[PDB]
Amino acid sequence: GTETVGKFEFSRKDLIGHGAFAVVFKGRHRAAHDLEVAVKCINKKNLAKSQTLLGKEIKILKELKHENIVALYDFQEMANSVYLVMEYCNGGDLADYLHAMRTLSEDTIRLFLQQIAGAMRLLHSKGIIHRDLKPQNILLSNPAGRRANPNSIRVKIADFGFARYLQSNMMAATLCGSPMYMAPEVIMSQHYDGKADLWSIGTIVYQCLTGKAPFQASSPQDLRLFYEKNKTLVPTIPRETSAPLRQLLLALLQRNHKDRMDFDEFFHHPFLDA
Numbered sequence: 001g002t003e004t005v006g007k008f009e010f011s012r013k014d015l016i017g018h019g020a021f022a023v024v025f026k027g028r029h030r031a032a033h034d035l036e037v038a039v040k041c042i043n044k045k046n047l048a049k050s051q052t053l054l055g056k057e058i059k060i061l062k063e064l065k066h067e068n069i070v071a072l073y074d075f076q077e078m079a080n081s082v083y084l085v086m087e088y089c090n091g092g093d094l095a096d097y098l099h100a101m102r103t104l105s106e107d108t109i110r111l112f113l114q115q116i117a118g119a120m121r122l123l124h125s126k127g128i129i130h131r132d133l134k135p136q137n138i139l140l141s142n143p144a145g146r147r148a149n150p151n152s153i154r155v156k157i158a159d160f161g162f163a164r165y166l167q168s169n170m171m172a173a174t175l176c177g178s179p180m181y182m183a184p185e186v187i188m189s190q191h192y193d194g195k196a197d198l199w200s201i202g203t204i205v206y207q208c209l210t211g212k213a214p215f216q217a218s219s220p221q222d223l224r225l226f227y228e229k230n231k232t233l234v235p236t237i238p239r240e241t242s243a244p245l246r247q248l249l250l251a252l253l254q255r256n257h258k259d260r261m262d263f264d265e266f267f268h269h270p271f272l273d274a
């Protein structure tokens with residue numbers, strides 16, 4: 001029936017989410033039932049890798065407290081089980097929101113990107129790269145429910161199981177992330193750095209604007225080959241897109257990470273102001 005983790009409880013009937021490496025249930029605080037949580041647990045179908053990823057996510061999330069990072073309230077790590085008690089975001093993920101809305105207005109995109117940028121400032125200052133940014137890993141919190149403004153929505157980054165520290169004079173080479181949101185250097189099995197995350201942000205923004213990822217293929221292999229053959233990548237951006245947002249997209253969606261927008265440029269882009 002009811003299972004308990006510290007001061008929190010959940011039942012496995014309340015399944016929120018399922019992946020290869022985690023299973024997520026809705027739960028609540030045992031003493032304040034109105035305080036909702038999401039409890040992330042091992043997926044026993046991939047026991048070893050799931051246990052490893054959840055352990056790593058605990059390590060990273062312990063260091064990252066921010067309004068736009070889904071919060072770790074508590075956790076419980078044992079030899080044969082791992083639980084993470086997470087902030088509950090009632091609005092679901094950005095991918096589903098985009099399906100419902102079809103596209104977002106530039107004003108909404110600005111509101112969401114300002115918030116993503118604030119969380120990315122904290123990762124950058126800590127020397128952490130996320131490596132799995134995609135709309136499914138952006139959660140929305142809508143505390144005001146049906147009576148909420150656009151400004152009311154809070155956006156929060158989730159899933160730090162693939163994140164790592166990267167020393168400023170080093171490069172990463174681990175192949176991870178989701179093919180359609182992976183920087184070209186990542187999917188081509190090359191060395192990469194924090195600018196890979198900036199490509200993924202660019203793809204997320206493009207998808208908000210158009211409803212589609214910017215470069216599509218019938219398979220990851222085919223996407224790799226496409227990136228390998230095309231030295232210049234220009235996403236197809238709708239003609240009515242404002243010039244500042246267009247400039248931002250083109251700077252983020254640079255094939256070559258040397259040419260790509262860097263963090264200081266992203267953080268201070270005028271689109272994020274007005």
Ligand SMILES: c1ccc2c(Nc3cc(C4CCC4)[nH]n3)nc(Nc3ccc4nc[nH]c4c3)nc2c1
Binds near residue numbers: 038070086
């Ligand atoms: C309706 C209402 C709420 C949700 C929801 N809420 C969550 C999820 C979490 C934290 C557990 C890790 C994030 N806090 N709040 N999540 C989901 N799906 C999901 C659940 C785990 C996820 N991990 C990465 N992306 C995920 C996407 N659907 C929903 C549909």
